[PDB]
Amino acid sequence: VDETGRKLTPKEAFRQLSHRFHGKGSGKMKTERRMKKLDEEALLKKMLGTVALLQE
């Protein structure tokens, strides 16, 4: 599990293990991409027919 408490897929679990093992993490761009993906998932999960009906 990650610090936020989400179940961790084995691939990124090993990613974190290897980071901690070697002693160097991912780049800034990759961190930003990962975080933006997490908040994208949060925004999608936390939730045009009327528009189409009105425009028809």
Binding site: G5, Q16, L17, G23, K24
Partner: peptide, 21 residues
């Protein structure tokens, strides 16, 4: 509950050959 795994380091340590705690 669950906690993040606490792994040790091998490469680029500047420390003793043996592991820390």
């Amino acid at each position: 509950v669950s906690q993040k795994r606490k792994y040790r380091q091998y490469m680029n340590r500047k420390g003793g050959f043996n592991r820390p705690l």
